[PDB]
Design a protein around this nucleic acid. Structure first.
Lengths: 74, 92, 71
RNA sequence: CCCGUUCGGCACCUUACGAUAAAUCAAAAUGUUUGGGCUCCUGGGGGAGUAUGGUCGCAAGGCUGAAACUUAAAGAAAUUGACGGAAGGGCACCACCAGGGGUGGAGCCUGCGGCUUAAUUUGACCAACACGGGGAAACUCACCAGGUCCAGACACGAUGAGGAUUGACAGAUUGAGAGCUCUUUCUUGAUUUCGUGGGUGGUGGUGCAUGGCCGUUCUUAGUUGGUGGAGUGAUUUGUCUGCUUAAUUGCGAUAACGAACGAGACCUUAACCUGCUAAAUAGCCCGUAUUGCCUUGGCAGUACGCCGGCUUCUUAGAGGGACUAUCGGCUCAAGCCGAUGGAAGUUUGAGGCAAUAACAGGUCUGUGAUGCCCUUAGAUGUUCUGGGCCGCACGCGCGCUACACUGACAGAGCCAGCGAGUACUCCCUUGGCCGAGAGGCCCGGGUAAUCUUGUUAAACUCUGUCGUGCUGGGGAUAGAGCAUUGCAAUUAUUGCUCUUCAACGAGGAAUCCCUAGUAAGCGCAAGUCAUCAGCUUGCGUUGAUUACGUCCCUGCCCUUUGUACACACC
RNA sequence: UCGGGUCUUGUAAUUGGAAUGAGUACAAUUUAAAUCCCUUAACGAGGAACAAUUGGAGGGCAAGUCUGGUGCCAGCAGCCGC
């Protein structure tokens, strides 16, 4: 029997800690100097959504936060 | 107290360990008690319970015999008295 | 041999304290024990001897009563 | 030589009016009611008959003879147990006689030891080892190499909606579409996170800390109050010389009499009922239609009857029946044996439950039964991938197949019983069709004396082939191919098809089980089960040789006996 | 029947009454001279005072199967023992 020694060779596994975001929602508009307020990023197919739905336009590939709309735009 | 309530016999056994290194058991008895056959299956009522104490666990066992009659016993009816009479007689 | 050379640690196998734990093995105490048994027996027996001889339920369902402006 | 009296000796038997703690004693009496006369010796156990002095002796030694110091018990007589390499009685096919069938010989299945491996998880040494209901492909699983998650309750202090806290596409990254992590930013929002305290869980340790349960002592016959007798007392007789029985089951003798548990009685099941109550989910007779042959008028079959008649057979309820009944020789008796009658004459056959009291018996790996210790977020918690428990020079145990003619092989004739079966699931399966074989497709019945099922089982019986040769007896080892169960078959699950054709000629020293529908042979159902039985629990078919005993061996209990043991020969 | 009266006792309840020396101090007495004692003017008791201790509570041996701490340690116990 007995409890033998253990050496977990891998140093440590560290979780995905959330990088700080300090009110990044105010960046999401463009106000027309005390008039109408046009929007920035356009919407998606919203069969089950429609409000505030932004599209991760980074490099030729996008998705929706809930709908997961994988669309290759190129 | 059982037999004050009118019981034909009883037996209580206690065992376990509470304040000693080894286990100790006691058994107290009085009256009559049958053990072998199906009369013993039905006449006796038994029960068993645990109890937990600061130091361990104690086991209690209780048996009670309530006194339609045992097959072994035999009862003889008292003979009825009668008297001899004179040989002649007559009636209506 | 499983008997003479105990293989555990001697830990408070005091028969004197056990006597208190179980029952003192003296004649004098037993008489007092019998007196106490007589005292306890009677009280249990006598108890056996004496013994032997604003509607709102609709409102629960009624929650959809409240209504709000149309459209 | 015989009978008797007396004096003086060596002794003995019964008894206690007497004595003592008792064993016992005609003195060990005439002693708390204490005095016939005289001499010697001891004052808890060791140190110690030692040291020193004196004295006798050729010497060995003899006679006289302390203290310091240490200790709470040493010792006598008797009682109950335990133990004995002591004796006497009894019981038992887990003992033997008289025998039957076997194992230990070979091959294989399977458990243990050991060896080896990263791991080969672990419990147990008559009463362990085909046991843990343990026939593990994952799961089970407690082990190894790896990877995730928290379900870390509640209370306190702080971050915090000028955002505590959650999830995620793609690319990389890993067996792995695990957001496990890394590149970038969308979404949810006070339940969470940090630290402190405090809990929860654990097939983690301790069965030598426990409960509960089971096994063994022990299938044997043993264990106790009341009144009385003996002893100052613990205790003892009752509970026994003898005979008998499976039995402390009985008869008897008796300082004992009358009783209580255990055994017996009790309950389940197997055998009998032409007598009762019966039954289309069981049968027979009878009546219609109808088939074949002899023809005759019948025989052998098919379908129907549901107020046609009945319950012998089948089946379940109430009862009855065997009690040793009658006999013939033993004998006080209890009984035993033998013949007749009868379905039944070993307690009619077989089981269930089962006394006082114990064991350092087994189980913490059954339990949300349970103390303490240990671990807790790089988990001993839970979960996913792969492996292993099966790895093998060799020792041992429970089984399976054979060594053939009392057999093998090929046709044909053909008889059971106990049981089991489908709802949110996939059971038992008939019939029709395809298929060499294993299998496949399509209707259907049965939640059941209704369907599977008359379960047409195996053994067995008749007619032939083979013919003493390890040959057509034997089937280990391997190659190729075809299917089924399952997510997955490699270390082959199993089945089917063709080929390959090992050892083994009745098994040494040793040793087991068993007394009549029994041993033995042969198969069938159920348990685990999706598949896998060489395993266990039950069922039926065929069906014998030898005995109605003893204490010689191996166990066990009762009496007498011994003890410096009583935690009791460990 | 939670009822009424007659005697005794106690009161984590209230008060109400009288008394006295432990000390202290005018006088005289005591004595070779003093002190103490025996008398006696003026003072002297209501709570934390004018406040009693030494050994014990398993048996011999009288008196708790209290409550916190320690865990064959510290210790106690003439003896048996904890």
């Amino acid at each position: 029997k007995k409890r033998k020694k253990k050496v977990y060779t891998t140093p440590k596994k560290i979780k995905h800690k959330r990088k700080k975001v300090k009110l990044a929602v105010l960046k999401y508009y463009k106000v027309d100097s005390d008039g109408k307020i046009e929007r920035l990023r356009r919407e998606c197919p919203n069969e089950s959504c429609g409000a505030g739905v932004f599209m991760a336009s980074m490099q030729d590939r996008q998705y929706c936060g809930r709908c997961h709309l994988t669309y290759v735009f190129d | 107290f059982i037999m004050e309530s009118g019981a034909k016999g009883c037996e209580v056994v206690v065992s376990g360990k509470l304040r000693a290194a080894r286990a100790k058991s006691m058994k107290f008895t009085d009256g009559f008690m049958i053990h072998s056959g199906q009369p013993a299956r039905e006449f006796i009522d038994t029960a068993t319970r645990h109890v937990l104490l600061r130091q361990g666990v104690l086991g209690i066992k209780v048996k009670i015999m309530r006194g339609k009659t045992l097959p072994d016993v035999v009862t003889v009816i008292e003979p009825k008295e009668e008297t001899p009479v004179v040989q002649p007689m007559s009636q209506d | 041999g499983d008997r003479h050379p105990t293989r555990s640690a001697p830990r408070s196998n005091s028969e004197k304290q056990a006597s208190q734990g179980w029952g003192a093995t003296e004649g004098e105490a037993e008489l007092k024990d019998e007196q106490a048994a007589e005292e306890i027996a009677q009280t249990e027996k006598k108890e056996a001897a004496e013994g032997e001889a604003y509607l709102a339920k609709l409102a629960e369902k009624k929650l959809a009563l409240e209504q709000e402006n149309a459209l």
